[PDB]
Paper text:
The Ras proteins are master regulators of cell proliferation and survival that transduce growth stimuli emanating from cell-surface receptors to cytoplasmic kinases responsible for orchestrating a comprehensive cell division program. Ras proteins are cytosolic, membrane-bound GTPases that bind guanine nucleotides and are regulated by their nucleotide state: guanosine triphosphate (GTP)–bound Ras adopts a conformation that binds Ras effector proteins with high affinity, leading to their activation and downstream signaling, whereas guanosine diphosphate (GDP)–bound Ras adopts a conformation that cannot bind effectors and thus is inactive. Here, we report our initial findings on an alternative approach, one that exploits directed evolution to discover miniproteins having extraordinarily high affinity for the most functionally relevant surface of Ras, the effector domain. High-resolution crystal structures demonstrate that the miniproteins bind Ras as a dimer and interact via a distinct binding mode that captures the Ras effector domain in an open conformational state, which can be stabilized by insertion of a proline at Asp-38 in Ras.
As oncogenic Ras signaling is mediated by the GTP-bound state, we asked whether we could improve the nucleotide selectivity of the 225-11 miniprotein to favor binding to [name]-[name]. We prepared a scanning mutagenesis library that systematically randomized pairs of adjacent amino acids throughout the miniprotein sequence and then performed YSD with orthogonally labeled [name]-[name] and [name]-GDP targets. After two rounds of sorting for library members with improved selectivity for [name]-[name], the screen afforded a population with a consensus mutation of [name], located at the miniprotein residue closest to the γ-phosphate in the [name]/225-11 structure. [name] bound more strongly to both [name]-[name] and [name]-GDP but with a 2-fold overall improvement in selectivity for [name]-[name]. The crystal structure of 225-11 [name] bound to [name]-[name] revealed that the mutant arginine residue of the primary miniprotein protomer forms hydrogen bonds with two bound water molecules that solvate the γ-phosphate. GDP lacks the γ-phosphate, and Arg-30 is disengaged from the nucleotide in the [name]-GDP/225-11 [name] structure; thus, this interaction likely contributes to the improved nucleotide selectivity of this miniprotein mutant.
Numbering used by the authors:
A (entry chain A): 1 to 28, 38 to 105, 108 to 164
B (entry chain B): 3 to 32
C (entry chain C): 2 to 32
Amino acid sequence: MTEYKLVVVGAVGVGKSALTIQLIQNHFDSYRKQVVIDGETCLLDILDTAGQEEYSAMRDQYMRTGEGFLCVFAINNTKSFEDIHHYREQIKRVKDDVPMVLVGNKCDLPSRTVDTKQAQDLARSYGIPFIETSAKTRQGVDDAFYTLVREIR
Amino acid sequence: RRPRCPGDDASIEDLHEYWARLWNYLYRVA
Amino acid sequence: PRRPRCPGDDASIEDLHEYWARLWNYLYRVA
Ligand SMILES: Nc1nc2c(ncn2[C@@H]2O[C@H](COP(=O)(O)OP(=O)(O)NP(=O)(O)O)[C@@H](O)[C@H]2O)c(=O)[nH]1
Ligand SMILES: [Mg+2]
Ligand SMILES: [Mg+2]
């Protein structure tokens, strides 16, 4: 019965759509999934944003309805990790203390340029939880979204 | 990829499903 | 709570935006 409007943000190619598709459809169209979080059936509505910047006023206003934000980087893409502050500031701006989860996606891949502590330093520094995920294997995907719910409430 | 409204007699569940599709559609057409 | 009517498949983006917002309010008010 309780609904959560979640927004997924991050650079081009980090796996925002993959995470959304993995959560909802269990694949590697619907933007809504019924989940059970700690015995309570919850409903997750997901906005899967674009990595490509369009400088759109109205896109910011659709983001504004979001209650929580997964900030996704890819662990083998340093530029995508460097982009993270821009997304956190983008979020705080459109929302005017916004619930957030740093997501390090593609943890299945061997060569990683961003280590766990380097990501977790930034996460503790912002005051937000951090989850490693793989849209490919589903590692930590439910954890990521279920943790964002816990962060909103 | 515009979603169609599922009807004036649509269930509340169906309207929620439609709302989430619209949210993404409207975001995308910018 | 007034259920907003289906916007019509020829609706402008502005009209669909209005309907989207009003639908959320409606779904909130009937929950
Ligand atoms: N190995 C691996 N590949 C992934 C993972 N997640 C996404 N990918 C791959 O990364 C590429 C881009 O993924 P996609 O979900 O489109 O990322 P996006 O952030 O939605 N891109 P955009 O911002 O342009 O819409 C795809 O080839 C996809 O298969 C993952 O967890 N592991
Ligand atoms: Mg995508
Ligand atoms: Mg990023």
